[PDB]
DNA sequence: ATCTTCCCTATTTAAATTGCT
DNA sequence: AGCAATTTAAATAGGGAAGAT
């Protein structure tokens, strides 16, 4: 599948990962990831890396995405579209912490608050140490951290560039 | 085999490989690998080169030098010359240094022409970048590369001293290194001691650039002891200064393409000499040095 | 010769910016300035510290600040006054056996370029670190001695030529080379979008404390004066292996990258001022760097 | 330089060396090259002729002397190029080589019989403590002793009997006792704590009967019964026939063992032990892979079971036999014939033609080079070594920097790195700055050299860089601690490499007076061991005391007695070569060394005394030494200065004394322009090195180059307050010195730091000796023990230097050269000589120099410790941040002339001063505040 | 890599005749038609001249130039009467030290400094005479040689131009040629085309001093296109200017002795190696040309 | 062509043994 | 004890072929 590169440059004044996350947000908000364009990162060791890599099967051109990232052009670099027979596809993994599932136990099982604390008191509290990005969510008005990890390649992708199922 | 290199306008730097050069029936010929003899016309060549697998004889040497055809010994490829004599005005009638050589000396001496020629060598280095456009490399007309080019142009034009020009030259060279690293998805930092593909491929490509710049400086009789940017104690600094023109325009994209596809060194050598033969890079350096020294 | 540097030698700060107060406007309704309020949301979570494992059962009710634009204004306005002051060669704590030699060694400093890069860092948006990111429109208005200057598209990394920055740079270099002061009221209008989250400067919190303090003057989000002063002097493109302009430090040192560019390679300020008072020939760029440090100021004694 | 290279080589190693030797010389045909080349061309030809591979057979002739000989080519004894050399040349009553072969073979087949107990099996498998209650060498010794008590141990079937715990395994049979000591001490020597035994035991067996299990083998002792229940699975074919053939070899040769002397037995058993550890470590290093199970000896890196004990014993036997063969039948690789040595010395080196008075065909030589400093002593030592032929020597010197100085002299005169090997085993970070290309200095560690044939018998092909430089060096310019381990070690196989090094190489020890008393004892032990194999000892010390020169001669004489009776040759005596800058004297001395040595000493004294007095010392009368230092500085600046500028050296004793003198002089109000330096040893890597290079370049007074390293325009007193680090190995030239008295050799050495380079005589006085050491105000009972030979057993009756020294005296080496034992309680010189003859005596004692009987034990390596210092922990400065309780401080900034800063490095603090903060400072390093 | 021998400390020099020079197992060796392959010490060779009937491969030049050996050919303009172009390849692949070019050209461009440098090199003739004495020929201290040396120094002191210099050369050389000839009892006319030994040995020594002078020039980086002596009959450049320091001191006494003592060409060639390495003439010329450029 | 590596190819040296004087 | 005959074998030289530049 042919692919394109979006490398964050000159982001020292601002962290590199903040520019990476803003690149993800601007690629989300102006379309791009309809259902078939996916992201991958060549340098996840402990950081998310500074290269966004889009491996759309139909083909991503330079002009559409450089018009999309007109806001990041001061510290971005776009390579010409190259080809890759295999891309290392990542997916979204989310975390739950206490009250999250407590409200689920309010609205699914219909139990009271104290017994919902009782079934979950000694449980939960997982801690994801995977490399991540920090995403502005616009439909739900709060900003969060989204965790990415390696999984088998899927035909369909989300609106963010990660695998489905 | 037989190889033609245009150098100035009409004289041709002949390169002969796997052949035995001697005198047959009163004129210089050479037996090739296929057992077929080939003669050489004295009128159209001034530089004749002896690549790998090549032997020349004494009366062939004498008759070649008596016809104005001055011979040099080179490593196979034609741009890695290790042995020659010095160009004169005429080979037989007199012994004077070439006008180009004398002009270079005078320009180097007076401090103002040396500064103006240092600015000019960097102007033509930016020209070289645009002139020699590659396919696999980055776009020279791209906005980041053009911003680097205009930054270098402003910095060279506004500078009044050599150490400012050295800082600006290093900024431009390593900025193009950073741009090509941003292309080829790698953390590239220029060090000669590294054993990775990009650094060692750039190192041996730089050695090829030094060889072709040495041939271009020799072919107009320019000596190897008058550097423009580099210091007076730098041995062969003019070879490095002339090779700087094509290090970041030709050697750098070819070397990064070679490390990207990962092929071996001899076929990188054949790619470098193919780019030198196709676009007449030595002729570009010859005309560059003529325009620098003539002023 | 061997003019040894005074141990009390210091220079005053010559680029004094105010705190960058932050307001919410529209793009075509630029006069209605509503102050951006730092909200603060509570977060429930147990404490986890290395020194107190016995206290991890209960506590640490933390309340972390945040600052967004309101949902009716799409433009963030940043107001601050940058005050350039002259006689950068006067040492305030130093004296004049060394500082007077510095005066007579840095008199050939082209202040034009120094000032250009200062006003270019003012205008292009170096003072707007994380909130110029993702903005579809950047604007800078500079008011100086009843003169208004408008800047729209200046790429901040390279210092390209525009006659507007140059115009102000003239009076700024005339101040910095001579005696006096000049004040630039700088208002930045960046169109981020409707309700986009803005970025004030951060107070230092402890390893524990709370997650993040945003900078408040009288309840309103703002950014630090020294942080803007970091932005203005971010003009250093003259160290060896100079890729991007860094803040002019006496050691060329950036904390956030974990490396120092001018330390340990004979291009630090101190070796250059000792070379200046011992009188070896400086180039224009390192002398401009030394004058930029003296504009920045700081104690140089040892 | 005209050379001729001939090739003896077979193979195409007559072909791929022909390319390199035909790159540098013309071909005269018949595999012979001949032509003109430079000395650097000789070095390049050596470097690319040796590195081309193994089997190079190259002889080079410069004029008619052999330049070099690649390989073990016999080449020339008289004529050059022999005909065919086949076999069976001499075949004598070798006797002692058959004795060493029998002892090593019999012991090596019995050295690891004690790993067969169940405790060692579960130790290798790993279900118990890896430290045994009794070490397996002692268990194998118990096995052999029980078998010898039961059956006739020399001619019987083996069968391992039921053994119990034995406190002692040493009986009376001298040969059995030799085999038992080889078995038990194949890992470590036994250590005897007993004071009466240490007082009285001298003989071979009579000391060996005191070596019990409690001397290190008996660790804790709770599983002794499991440590002595043993299986007998060794009874196989090849092990039994190997044991039988070696036992019968010993049986046939042990008749010459009783005709040996004590000295022989000790040296022969030392050689046997060295070959036994060589074979044991050689077989333990390599992995053999195959095993017959049910019993095991060693473990691999993965901890798996390997090297079963039958084939382990057989492999250790053959490797030790081969070790012995190559160390006893080696023609070692010698250095090049340096052509810049053999010509005449001119002017002040004209005494170096004394080598033309020495015989070139003597098998042994004991040089006592009493020449003064600045005359080229080490060059004269190399000349004396090259007078006998090609050079093979170990230049063992104190300090790293003195080895660097001798290496730089060897490099710039004639010696390349194909013959020289500078060894400093610490990897110091003192680099040369300014210009790497324009250095022409900083002798480094490469050693292109030539790998000797002895590397194949060492463990895992010797080692990497360091031991290859040790063993294979023709000339080994080394720090001395890489050579004093030849005499023996506590634990491990660190004895074998300097032992085999000093076996085939000469020993050259320069300025042995700067070493400690125990250091000089173990150095004379090394001299005795070097003389045990016929090598030549060159001692080069000007201020030699008769006692020292005598005990070094007696060590060489006992060693040459070992070597003479070892080759069954009648002992004619030792060729002693007395040498100084006024003459030479070569005598065959077998007895009456003392009268000849004192006559040479008196002749050197009369050749020193009619020369002009260069160091006139006045002992001050001022009691308080602080103001004595003040008044003496004022007086010697007003008398001794070069146009108002004078250089003074305040030699004090210890570090806090140095900072006390510095802090007094900095606060001292005077019209003199005092500029103070601190020059002690407690300093950080950077700071210390910087002081050294500066001081060496400002106190150089052979030319006027220093006028540019100091401000000589203004009249200034450049004062350097230093500890004994200035009086050892420093080429410094002060205008005058003020000395705190600690020892008389300190007085002579700090006289040697004044007018060292000039020849102008002083008029009035150039040395002012202090009335008392500063320890008088801290300890009036004993004050000269720090950096001196006063001690608790040798106390001066008076500490006044008017009582114990001359008030006006011309200080030279004469007082140290003469030697006086009477009136040692009220004179410093006779106190010095007393200690020197009362510690380095002709006895064996236990910490003495003739040590016999104790070499078998671990006693001379425990109670006589080389470089015996205090605990010494190292506070390390890491990038400006100190490690321990250091606390950087600020100096007085009154008169500091030069102060170099430091960021890395380490300071050596005694554990006593670790209690408090050492308070490191940039000007003066360590103190008590 | 090592120090690779200083080129002043190379002692072997060759002029090969009627051979094929090649590489056989990495060996610079010349093969004759009788089947004899003689090796050359290429890491110790100063120069290899090539006479008529000679031939050399590429690889032999490659590992002679890497070892710093200057290779010239004795034909072409090698008839020595015009002395226009003796075809002389140098190893310029090695980047030479530059400062001797800088001080040399500072004095070259300045014509008054060139005139003074010419006078110093003309005084080097008599310096060579005094330093290099011969015990089988003319004593330097006799009345004729002392008189003509005094006349030469007092003429070159008051000299004004290079035309005046050209004339002083005529006198010194021609009359030293003659003075030897009258003491060797031979009517002698210098002729490069003459067959007598007194001229064939002189031309062989001319080629030998050509090789020594050119190796001394190249060592410092100095070329040939910067001569100090300009004249009608002085075609050939700086190599003959350096070489005629040591005609009448070295080459001419050896050639005259050889011819008189009936030496063969081979032994004259060897006598030339013996004098050029026993007195260390290459280091003499190299250090003396450092004295010439200096500032 | 040139030069290198390797495989024949057998031609060419060195050792080894042993009666014989 | 030197040698001779005579075997035995290790190695040296060379030519042809093929693969590199
Ligand atoms: Mn063991
Ligand atoms: Mn063992």
DSSP string computed for D419-452: TEEEE-TT-------S-STT------S-------
Nearest chain B Cα distance for residue A86, angstroms: 16
The DSSP letter of residue E2 is -
Chain G: nucleotides under 7 Å from a protein CB? 10-13, 20-21
Would you say the C-beta of B52 is within 7 Å of strand F?
yes
CB D109 within 8 A of CB D243: yes
The Cα–Cα gap between D33 and E41 comes to 10
Distance in Å, CA D562 to ligand 2 centroid: 29
Here the tokens at position C256 are 């956030």
For the CA of D84 and the C1' of F14, the distance in angstroms is 9
In D514-602, where do the E strands start and end? 537-540, 574-580, 583-589
The Cα–Cα gap between B272 and D354 comes to 68
CB D148 within 8 A of CB D161: no
CB D842 within 8 A of CB D832: no
Would you say the C-beta of E62 is within 7 Å of strand F?
no
Q: Tell me whether strands D583-589 and D881-882 are parallel, antiparallel or unpaired.
A: unpaired
CB D509 within 8 A of CB D403: no
The Cα–Cα gap between A56 and A89 comes to 12
Q: Which residues pair with D538 in a beta bridge?
A: D367, D508
Give long-range contacts, CB 8 A cutoff, 24+ apart: C23-26: C23/C76, C23/C77, C23/C78, C23/C79, C23/C220, C24/C69, C24/C70, C24/C73, C24/C75, C24/C76, C24/C77, C25/C73, C25/C75, C25/C76, C25/C77, C25/C189, C26/C73, C26/C74, C26/C75
Would you say the C-beta of D86 is within 7 Å of strand F?
yes
C61 Rama class: left (phi>0) / alpha (psi -120 to 50) / beta: beta
Contacts for D162 with CB less than 8 Å, ≥ 6 apart: D146
The DSSP letter of residue C228 is H
Q: Which residues pair with B93 in a beta bridge?
A: none
Contacts for D597 with CB less than 8 Å, ≥ 6 apart: D368, D546, D549, D550, D553, D576, D578
Data resolution in angstroms: 2.9
Chain F: nucleotides under 7 Å from a protein CB? 1-5, 14-16
Scan residues 12-51 of D and list those with Cβ closer than 8 Å to E: 15, 18-19, 22-27, 35-38, 40-41, 43-44, 47-48
Which chain B residues are Cβ-neighbours of A42 within 8 angstroms?
185
Report in angstroms the alpha-carbon separations of D336 from A23, D18, D34, D390, E150: 71, 20, 17, 7, 49
Report in angstroms the alpha-carbon separations of C249 from B193, C90, C291, D73: 31, 18, 11, 68
User: How many C-beta atoms surround the C-beta of residue D209 within 10 A?
Assistant: 17
Obtained via which technique? cryo-EM
C7 and chain A: CB distance < 8 Å anywhere?
Answer: no
D823 Rama class: left (phi>0) / alpha (psi -120 to 50) / beta: left
Query: Any idea of the CA torsion for D226, D230, D231, D235, to the nearest 10 degrees?
Result: 160
Q: Which helix (H) or strand (E) holds E179?
A: helix E162-183
The Cα–Cα gap between E19 and D82 comes to 37
User: How many C-beta atoms surround the C-beta of residue D220 within 10 A?
Assistant: 11
D819 Rama class: left (phi>0) / alpha (psi -120 to 50) / beta: left
The Cα–Cα gap between D864 and D828 comes to 25
CB-based burial of residue C174 (10 Å sphere; 0-12 exposed, 13-18 middle, 19+ buried)?
A: middle
CB E28 within 8 A of CB E42: yes
The neighbourhood of ligand 1, an ion, using CB within 5 A, equals D 112
Nearest chain A Cα distance for residue B257, angstroms: 13
Here the tokens at position D465 are 């860089």
Closest residue by Cα to residue D747 from D801, D682, D825: D801
The residue written with tokens 């401000």 in the block is D711
Chain B residue with minimal CA distance to A4?
B183
CB D509 within 8 A of CB D537: yes
For D652-663, b where at least 16 C-beta lie within 10 A, e where not — what string? bbbbbbbbbbbb
Q: Which residues pair with E55 in a beta bridge?
A: B57, E20
The Cα–Cα gap between C296 and C15 comes to 7
A64 Rama class: left (phi>0) / alpha (psi -120 to 50) / beta: alpha
Chain B interface, best mutation among E69, E72, E87, by max B CB count within 10 A: E87
The Cα–Cα gap between B273 and B268 comes to 9
Closest residue by Cα to residue B210 from B177, B178, B251: B251
Closest residue by Cα to residue D129 from D229, D214, D226: D226
Beta sheet of E86-91, edge-to-edge order: B12-16, B45-50, B70-75, B80-84, E86-91, E70-76, E45-50, E12-16
Which chain C residues are Cβ-neighbours of B167 within 8 angstroms?
238, 240, 242, 285
CB D331 within 8 A of CB D454: no
| DSSP H helices in D109-160 | 118-125, 136-150
CB B78 within 8 A of CB B3: yes
In the three-class reduction of DSSP (H, G, I as helix; E, B as strand; rest coil), residue C160 is classed as coil
For D60-95, b where at least 16 C-beta lie within 10 A, e where not — what string? bbbeeebbbbbbebebeeeeeeeeeeeeeeeeeebb
From the alpha carbon of E31, which nucleotide's C1' atom is closest?
F2
Q: Tell me whether strands C20-25 and C220-223 are parallel, antiparallel or unpaired.
A: antiparallel
**First vs last Cα of chain D: how many Å apart?**
64
Query: Any idea of the CA torsion for B160, B166, B172, B175, to the nearest 10 degrees?
Result: -140
Subunits close to A (at least 3 CB pairs below 8 A):
B, C
Which chain C residues are Cβ-neighbours of B161 within 8 angstroms?
283-284
Closest residue by Cα to residue C98 from C177, C5, C13: C5
Give, to the nearest 10 degrees, the angle between helix B197-219 and helix B265-279: 40
Query: Any idea of the CA torsion for A66, A69, A75, A80, to the nearest 10 degrees?
Result: -30
E233 and chain B: CB distance < 8 Å anywhere?
Answer: no
**First vs last Cα of chain B: how many Å apart?**
38
Here the tokens at position A65 are 């995405």
SS (H, E, C) D269-316: HHHHHHHHHHHHHHHHHCCCCCCCCCCCCEECCCCCEECCHHHHHHHH
CB B116 within 8 A of CB B228: no
In chain C, where do the E strands start and end? 10-11, 15-17, 20-25, 34-35, 39-44, 61-66, 75-85, 137-143, 148-151, 181-191, 202-203, 213-214, 216-217, 220-223, 253-254, 259-260, 298-299
**What's phi and psi for D70, nearest 5 deg?**
-80, 120
CB-based burial of residue E142 (10 Å sphere; 0-12 exposed, 13-18 middle, 19+ buried)?
A: exposed
User: How many C-beta atoms surround the C-beta of residue C67 within 10 A?
Assistant: 22
CB D139 within 8 A of CB D227: yes
The residue written with tokens 């002019």 in the block is C248
User: How many C-beta atoms surround the C-beta of residue D866 within 10 A?
Assistant: 19
Q: Tell me whether strands E55-57 and E70-76 are parallel, antiparallel or unpaired.
A: unpaired
Tally: H helices and E strands in chain D:
27, 24
In the three-class reduction of DSSP (H, G, I as helix; E, B as strand; rest coil), residue D369 is classed as strand
């Amino acid at each position: 599948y042919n692919t394109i590169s979006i490398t964050v440059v000159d982001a020292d004044d601002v962290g590199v990962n903040f520019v990476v996350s803003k690149v993800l947000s601007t690629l989300h908000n102006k379309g791009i990831f309809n259902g078939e364009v996916g992201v991958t990162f060549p340098r996840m060791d402990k950081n998310v890396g500074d290269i966004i890599t889009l491996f759309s099967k139909t083909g991503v051109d330079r002009k559409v995405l450089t018009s999309t990232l007109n806001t990041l052009t001061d510290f971005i670099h776009i390579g010409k579209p190259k080809e890759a027979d295999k891309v290392k596809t990542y997916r979204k993994v989310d975390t739950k912490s206490k009250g999250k599932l407590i409200r689920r136990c309010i609205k699914r099982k219909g139990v009271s608050a104290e017994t919902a604390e009782s079934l979950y008191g000694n449980y939960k509290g997982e801690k994801c140490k995977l490399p991540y990005i920090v995403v502005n969510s616009k439909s739900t008005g709060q900003r969060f951290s989204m965790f990415l990890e390696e999984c088998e390649n899927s035909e369909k992708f989300n609106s963010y560039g990660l695998c489905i199922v | 085999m037989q190889k033609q290199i245009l150098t100035s306008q009409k004289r041709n730097m002949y390169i002969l490989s796997r052949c035995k050069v001697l005198v047959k029936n009163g004129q210089v010929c050479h037996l090739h690998e296929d057992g077929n003899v080939y003669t050489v016309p004295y009128a159209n060549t001034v530089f004749i080169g002896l690549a790998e697998g090549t032997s020349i004889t004494n009366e062939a040497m004498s008759m070649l030098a008596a016809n104005g055809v001055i011979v040099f010994w080179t490593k196979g490829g034609g741009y890695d010359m290790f042995a020659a004599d010095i160009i004169c005005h005429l080979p037989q009638a007199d012994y004077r240094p070439t006008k180009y050589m004398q002009n270079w000396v005078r320009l180097w001496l007076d401090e103002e022409k040396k500064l103006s020629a240092a600015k000019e060598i960097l102007k033509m280095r930016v020209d070289s970048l645009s002139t020699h456009v590659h396919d696999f490399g980055v776009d020279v007309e791209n906005k980041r590369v053009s911003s680097i080019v205009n930054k270098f142009d402003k910095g060279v034009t506004q500078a009044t001293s050599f150490e400012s020009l050295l800082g600006h030259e290093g900024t431009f060279v390593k900025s193009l290194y950073k741009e090509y690293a941003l292309e080829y998805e790698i953390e590239f930092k220029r060090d000669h001691k590294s054993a990775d593909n990009y650094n060692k491929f750039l190192t041996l490509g730089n050695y090829y650039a030094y060889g072709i710049a040495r041939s271009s400086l020799w072919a107009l009789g320019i000596d190897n002891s008058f550097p423009l940017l580099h210091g007076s104690t730098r041995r062969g600094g003019l070879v490095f200064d002339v090779a700087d023109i094509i290090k970041t325009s030709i050697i750098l994209p070819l070397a990064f393409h070679a490390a990207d596809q990962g092929m071996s060194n001899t076929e990188f050598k054949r790619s470098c000499v193919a780019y030198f033969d196709k676009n007449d890079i030595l002729a570009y350096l010859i005309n560059n040095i003529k325009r620098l020294c003539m002023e | 010769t061997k003019l040894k540097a005074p141990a009390v030698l210091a220079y005053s700060r010559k680029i004094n910016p105010t705190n960058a107060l932050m307001f919410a406007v529209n793009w075509s309704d630029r006069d209605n300035t509503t102050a951006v309020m730092v909200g603060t949301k509570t977060v429930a979570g147990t404490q986890s510290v290395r020194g107190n494992p016995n206290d991890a059962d209960k506590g640490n009710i933390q309340t972390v600040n945040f600052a967004n634009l309101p949902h009716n204004k799409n433009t963030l306005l940043v107001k601050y006054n940058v005050k350039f002051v002259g006689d950068v060669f006067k040492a305030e704590l130093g004296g004049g056996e060394y500082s007077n030699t510095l005066q007579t060694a840095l008199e050939n400093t082209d202040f034009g370029t120094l000032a250009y890069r200062y006003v270019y860092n003012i205008a292009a948006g170096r003072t707007l670190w994380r909130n110029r990111v993702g903005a579809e429109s950047i604007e800078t208005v500079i008011t100086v001695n009843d003169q208004t200057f408008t800047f729209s598209d200046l790429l901040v990394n390279e210092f390209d030529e525009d006659v507007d920055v140059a115009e102000i740079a003239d009076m700024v270099a005339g101040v910095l080379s001579g005696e006096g002061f000049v004040t630039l009221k700088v208002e930045h209008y960046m169109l981020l979008g409707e309700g986009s989250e803005v970025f004030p400067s951060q107070e230092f919190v402890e390893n524990s404390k709370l997650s993040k303090q945003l900078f408040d003057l009288n309840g309103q989000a703002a950014m630090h004066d020294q942080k803007i002063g970091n932005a203005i002097r971010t003009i250093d493109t003259w160290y060896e292996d100079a890729t991007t302009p860094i803040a002019v430090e006496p050691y060329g040192s950036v904390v956030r990258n974990g490396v120092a560019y001018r330390a340990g390679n004979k291009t630090d300020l101190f070796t250059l001022m000792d070379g200046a008072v011992n009188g070896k020939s400086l180039t224009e760029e390192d002398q401009m760097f030394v004058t930029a440090n003296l504009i920045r100021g700081g104690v140089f004694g040892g | 330089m005209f050379i001729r290279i001939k090739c003896f080589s077979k193979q195409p190693i007559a072909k791929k060396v022909s390319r390199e030797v035909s790159a540098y010389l013309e071909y005269t045909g018949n595999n012979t090259w001949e032509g003109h080349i430079s000395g650097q061309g000789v070095s390049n030809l050596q470097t690319k002729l040796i590195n081309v591979g193994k089997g190079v057979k190259v002889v080079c002739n410069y004029q008619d002397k052999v330049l070099f000989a690649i390989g073990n080519v016999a080449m020339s004894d008289t004529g050059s190029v022999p005909k065919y050399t086949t076999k069976k040349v001499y075949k004598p009553d070798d006797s002692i080589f058959t004795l060493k072969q029998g002892l090593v073979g019999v012991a090596a087949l019995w050295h690891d019989l004690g790993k067969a107990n169940s405790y060692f099996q579960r130790k290798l498998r790993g279900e118990c403590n890896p430290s045994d209650p009794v070490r397996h060498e002692w268990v194998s010794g118990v096995i052999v002793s029980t078998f010898a008590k039961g059956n006739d141990w020399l001619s019987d079937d083996f069968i391992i009997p039921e053994v119990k715990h034995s406190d002692n395994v040493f009986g009376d049979d001298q040969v059995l006792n030799a085999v038992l000591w080889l078995i038990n001490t194949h890992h470590k020597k036994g250590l005897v704590e007993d004071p009466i035994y240490r007082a009285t035991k001298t003989m071979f067996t009579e000391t060996l009967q005191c070596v019990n299990v409690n001397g290190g083998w008996f660790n804790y002792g709770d599983n002794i019964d499991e440590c002595y229940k043993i299986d007998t699975s060794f009874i196989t074919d090849t092990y039994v026939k190997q044991l039988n053939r070696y036992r019968k070899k010993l049986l046939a040769t042990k008749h010459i063992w009783f005709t040996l002397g004590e000295d022989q037995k000790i040296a022969i058993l030392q050689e046997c032990r060295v070959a036994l550890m060589l074979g044991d470590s050689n077989f333990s290093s390599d992995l053999i892979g195959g095993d017959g199970s049910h019993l095991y000896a060693n473990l691999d890196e993965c901890g798996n079971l390997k090297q079963t004990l039958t084939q382990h014993l057989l492999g250790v036997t053959d490797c030790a036999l081969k070790a012995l063969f190559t160390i006893n039948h080696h023609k070692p690789v010698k250095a090049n014939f340096i052509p810049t040595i053999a010509e005449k010395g001119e002017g002040k080196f004209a005494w170096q033609n004394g080598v033309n008075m020495v015989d070139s065909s003597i098998d042994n030589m004991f040089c006592i080079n009493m020449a003064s400093t600045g005359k080229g002593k080490t060059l004269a030592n190399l000349k004396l070594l090259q007078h006998f032929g090609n050079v093979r020597c170990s230049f063992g010197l104190g300090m790293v920097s003195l080895t660097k100085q001798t290496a730089k002299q060897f490099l710039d005169m004639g010696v390349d790195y194909n013959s020289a090997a500078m060894v400093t085993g610490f990897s110091k970070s003192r680099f040369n700055l300014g210009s790497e290309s324009l250095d022409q200095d900083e002798v480094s560690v490469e050693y292109w050299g030539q790998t000797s044939s002895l590397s194949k018998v060492f463990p895992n092909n010797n080692a990497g860089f360091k031991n290859k430089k040790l063993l294979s060096a023709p000339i080994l310019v080394t720090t001395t601690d890489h050579l004093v381990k030849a005499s023996g070690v506590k634990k491990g196989n660190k004895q074998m490499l300097p032992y085999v090094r000093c076996m085939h190489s000469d020993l050259v020890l320069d300025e042995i007076d700067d070493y400690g008393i125990e250091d000089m004892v173990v150095l004379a032990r090394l001299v005795y061991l070097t003389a045990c194999y016929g090598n030549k000892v060159i001692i080069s010390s000007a201020t030699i005391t008769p006692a020292i020169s005598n005990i070094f001669y007696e060590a060489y004489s006992s060693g040459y007695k070992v070597f003479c009776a070892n080759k069954q040759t009648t002992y004619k005596g030792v060729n002693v070569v007395w040498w100084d800058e006024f003459g030479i004297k070569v005598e065959k001395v077998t007895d009456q060394f003392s009268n000849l040595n004192t006559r040479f000493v008196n002749k050197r004294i009369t050749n020193l005394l009619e020369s002009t007095p260069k160091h006139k010392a006045l002992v001050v009368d001022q009691d308080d030494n602080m103001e004595a230092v003040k008044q003496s500085i004022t007086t010697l600046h007003n008398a001794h200065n070069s146009g108002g500028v004078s250089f003074g050296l305040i030699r004090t004793t210890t570090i806090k004394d140095c900072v006390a003198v510095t802090q007094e002089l900095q606060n001292w109000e005077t019209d003199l322009s005092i500029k103070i330096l601190c020059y002690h040893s407690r300093f950080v890597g950077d700071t210390k090195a910087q002081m050294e290079e500066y001081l060496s370049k400002v106190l150089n007074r052979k030319g006027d180059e220093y006028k540019k390293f100091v401000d000589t325009t203004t009249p200034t007193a450049y004062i350097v307050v230093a500890t004994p680090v200035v009086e050892v190995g420093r080429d410094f030239d002060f205008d005058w010195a003020i000395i705190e008295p600690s020892s008389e050799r300190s007085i002579v050495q700090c006289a040697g730091r004044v007018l060292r380079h000039r020849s102008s005589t002083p008029t009035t006085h150039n040395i002012h000796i202090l009335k008392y050491p500063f320890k008088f105000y801290r300890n009036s009972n004993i004050c000269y023990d720090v950096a001196g030979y006063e001690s608790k057993g040798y106390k001066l009756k008076s500490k006044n230097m008017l009582d114990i020294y001359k008030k006006e005296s011309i200080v030279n080496s004469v007082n140290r050269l003469q030697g006086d034992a009477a009136f040692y309680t009220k004179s410093l010189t006779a106190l010095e000589h007393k200690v020197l003859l009362d510690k380095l005596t002709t006895d064996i004692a236990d910490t003495n120099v003739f040590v016999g009987g104790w070499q078998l034990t671990a006693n001379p390596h425990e109670y006589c410790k080389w470089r015996r210092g205090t605990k010494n922990e190292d506070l390390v400065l890491t990038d400006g941040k100190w490690s321990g309780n250091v606390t950087t401080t600020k100096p007085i900034q009154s008169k500091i002339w030069r102060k170099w800063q430091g960021e890395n490095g380490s300071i050596t603090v005694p554990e006593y001063l670790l209690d408090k903060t050492i308070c490191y400072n940039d000007f003066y390093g360590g103190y008590e505040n």
